[PDB]
Amino acid sequence: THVLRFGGIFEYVESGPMGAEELAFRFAVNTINRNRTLLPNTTLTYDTQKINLYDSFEASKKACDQLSLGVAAIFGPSHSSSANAVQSICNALGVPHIQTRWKHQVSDNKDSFYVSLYPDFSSLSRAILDLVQFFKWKTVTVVYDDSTGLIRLQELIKAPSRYNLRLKIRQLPADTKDAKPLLKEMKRGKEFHVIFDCSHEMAAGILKQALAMGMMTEYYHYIFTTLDLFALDVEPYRYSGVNMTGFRILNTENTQVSSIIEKWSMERLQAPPKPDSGLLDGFMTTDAALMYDAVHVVSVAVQQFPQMTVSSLQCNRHKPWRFGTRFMSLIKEAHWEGLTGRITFNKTNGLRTDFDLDVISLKEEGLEKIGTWDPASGLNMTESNRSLIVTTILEEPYVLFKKSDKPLYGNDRFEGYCIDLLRELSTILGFTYEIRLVEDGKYGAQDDVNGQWNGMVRELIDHKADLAVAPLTITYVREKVIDFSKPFMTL
Amino acid sequence: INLYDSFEASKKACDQLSLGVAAIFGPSHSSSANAVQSICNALGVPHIQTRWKHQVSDNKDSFYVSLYPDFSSLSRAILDLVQFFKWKTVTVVYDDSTGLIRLQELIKAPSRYNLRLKIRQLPADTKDAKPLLKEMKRGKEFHVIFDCSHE
Numbered sequence: 041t042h043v044l045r046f047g048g049i050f051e052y053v054e055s056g057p058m059g060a061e062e063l064a065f066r067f068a069v070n071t072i073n074r075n076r077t078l079l080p081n082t083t084l085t086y087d088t089q090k091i092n093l094y095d096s097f098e099a100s101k102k103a104c105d106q107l108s109l110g111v112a113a114i115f116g117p118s119h120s121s122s123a124n125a126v127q128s129i130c131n132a133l134g135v136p137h138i139q140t141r142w143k144h145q146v147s148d149n150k151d152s153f154y155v156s157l158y159p160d161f162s163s164l165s166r167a168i169l170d171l172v173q174f175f176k177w178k179t180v181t182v183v184y185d186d187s188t189g190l191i192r193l194q195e196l197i198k199a200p201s202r203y204n205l206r207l208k209i210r211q212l213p214a215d216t217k218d219a220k221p222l223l224k225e226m227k228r229g230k231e232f233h234v235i236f237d238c239s240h241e242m243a244a245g246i247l248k249q250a251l252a253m254g255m256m257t258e259y260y261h262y263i264f265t266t267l268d269l270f271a272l273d274v275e276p277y278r279y280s281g282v283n284m285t286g287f288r289i290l291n292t293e294n295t296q297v298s299s300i301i302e303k304w305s306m307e308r309l310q311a312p313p314k315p316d317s318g319l320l321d322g323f324m325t326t327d328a329a330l331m332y333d334a335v336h337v338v339s340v341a342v343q344q345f346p347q348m349t350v351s352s353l354q355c356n357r358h359k360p361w362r363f364g365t366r367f368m369s370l371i372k373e374a375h376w377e378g379l380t381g382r383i384t385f386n387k388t389n390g391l392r393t394d395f396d397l398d399v400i401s402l403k404e405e406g407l408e409k410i411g412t413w414d415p416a417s418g419l420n421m422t423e424s425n426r427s428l429i430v431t432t433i434l435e436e437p438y439v440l441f442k443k444s445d446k447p448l449y450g451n452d453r454f455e456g457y458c459i460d461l462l463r464e465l466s467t468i469l470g471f472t473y474e475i476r477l478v479e480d481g482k483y484g485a486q487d488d489v490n491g492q493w494n495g496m497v498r499e500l501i502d503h504k505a506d507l508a509v510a511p512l513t514i515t516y517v518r519e520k521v522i523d524f525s526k527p528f529m530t531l
Numbered sequence: 532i533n534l535y536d537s538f539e540a541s542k543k544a545c546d547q548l549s550l551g552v553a554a555i556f557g558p559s560h561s562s563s564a565n566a567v568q569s570i571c572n573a574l575g576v577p578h579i580q581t582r583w584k585h586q587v588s589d590n591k592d593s594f595y596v597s598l599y600p601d602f603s604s605l606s607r608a609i610l611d612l613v614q615f616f617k618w619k620t621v622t623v624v625y626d627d628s629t630g631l632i633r634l635q636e637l638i639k640a641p642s643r644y645n646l647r648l649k650i651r652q653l654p655a656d657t658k659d660a661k662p663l664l665k666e667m668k669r670g671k672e673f674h675v676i677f678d679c680s681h682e
């Protein structure tokens with residue numbers, strides 16, 4: 041029947057195997073072909089070209105070859121310089137360029153033949169800040185890997201002048217093994233609240249260093265910028281009590297999406313996994329779920345343009361593709377439920393600025409969902425006969441252990457003036473109670489350096505006790521922090 | 532060539548390499564300059580740059596030099612000057628993303644030295660800048676670094 045060809049350009053170092061992106065591309069095409077609801081009468085074909093990383097010259101040549109073979113779109117390469125070069129070519133010949141990865145948008149750049157399936161930085165930036173504010177952090181250390189990290193967090197970096205966040209900015213070194221000296225400074229600095237802006241492979245690496253450093257405990261809370269957080273081996277850390285929170289755009293809760301991610305692991309996990317990585321083997325990363333979603337969203341557009349056919353275009357000549365303008369318009373208007381949730385582009389710039397994120401945190405069970413985020417709602421986090429606990433302290437003759445012939449259990453082990461008072465109060469006011477001897481053997485004073493209380497006063501402040509029944513002197517400093525009865529003895 | 536047309540920059544660079552040239556004083560702006568640099572690298576003709584663009588570490592091109600004073604050094608000299616004026620408070624105002632990068636040395640200082648610092652962004656047009664300046668005024672931000680073009 042009817043046939044349409046897509047182009048693919050995938051970046052790599054050394055040689056095979058195939059990478060995640062080129063794999064998801066092929067996988068999406070094979071799947072769609074077999075779907076009888078999507079492109080029923082249409083059968084997708086493709087040319088794939090492999091190039092070196094950062095060789096924009098080679099990327100240009102391969103894109104020109106593909107436009108010569110004839111293609112309806114180029115799922116151009118990932119990295120900034122090659123991607124900008126294929127985008128300029130695609131714009132001159134009016135063939136849609138489909139991107140899956142963020143690159144810096146220059147304002148005065150007029151290219152219009154591209155869409156990008158990657159969740160725009162502006163929106164992610166805001167959702168980081170939204171999360172920080174929900175945890176009520178007033179202090180936070182942002183740690184980034186390379187320059188462009190800065191740009192992904194600009195919304196956050198500019199907050200300290202509107203809201204009340206003091207914030208320290210540090211940079212990782214090239215290698216995470218070099219990161220102890222940096223972590224030691226944060227430790228001395230008491231920087232317990234930390235955002236890591238970096239790849240998920242960097243994050244796996246920096247966590248190991250953080251463990252070594254005594255920094256994976258209940259005292260530390262780490263927010264992760266990476267969307268591939270869910271790919272991290274979390275077995276070394278879930279028992280420790282650290283808090284790890286981040287985001288996930290891969291819609292794993294949907295059953296249809298889980299089954300697709302599985303069939304992927306079978307053809308992929310079948311090939312090289314690593315031991316010392318700290319990543320789960322055969323998890324579908326975001327770079328690849330996006331490519332697979334891009335092939336679908338573009339196909340939804342092809343369904344609405346049966347007239348369209350490929351033309352052999354030459355980079356030599358300034359003659360664009362007849363159907364380009366109309367196809368590009370259909371793609372930008374397209375809507376699709378894919379591996380990464382609602383797909384919808386921005387009328388204005390063709391960037392994916394509106395999308396849905398699950399919000400995930402480390403519980404002892406593993407990484408689990410604790411809410412959602414979307415740009416229009418912010419966070420949607422999904423959150424009398426009692427005995428009184430009486431704190432007291434041994435002090436003659438107020439509270440002592442009773443000497444008795446009879447067996448004594450529980451509260452009846454104690455006697456004294458304060459015990460007699462407690463018994464009367466419990467009868468008059470009608471409560472039951474449990475007597476507990478205070479853990480530090482103190483009445484209650486405030487530390488002159490850190491301002492923390494101890495003794496029975498601290499038990500009350502922290503609501504660990506209901507009552508302190510003891511010869512607790514009523515003083516100015518104490519009455520400011522607890523509520524005393526009127527005195528039962530004056531002296 | 533047009534600004535930001537890396538495709539046209541590629542074509543013109545190829546024409547020139549065809550005429551024969553000992554070096555291309557390639558174009559100024561990031562995307563066209565990166566494209567002419569990749570071409571120049573494949574054909575081993577020196578590409579001479581005059582403007583800063585972001586250096587990617589894992590990029591292996593070797594046939595270029597850049598006459599623009601590197602950002603790392605300028606960053607330090609800004610910080611050196613701030614410290615000589617003994618400022619402990621400063622508001623950095625930048626125009627566009629890449630401004631951030633030129634001041635990274637300065638932005639990372641508040642954890643080593645004793646500088647509290649506030650980071651604000653200019654709007655597209657400076658005529659729109661009164662509301663921003665009013666906040667700085669109320670804020671008593673008397674010490675200010677402007678990272679932006681001379682225009």
Ligand SMILES: O=C(O)[C@@H]1C[C@H]2C[C@@H](CN3CC(F)(F)C[C@H]3C(=O)O)CC[C@H]2CN1
Pocket residue numbers: 435483484511512513514
């Ligand atoms: O609330 C308090 O801090 C005190 C503790 C406790 C203090 C004792 C008296 N002090 C115990 C002491 F021996 F340590 C010295 C003596 C005193 O200062 O005269 C009497 C019963 C108590 C009255 N309230």
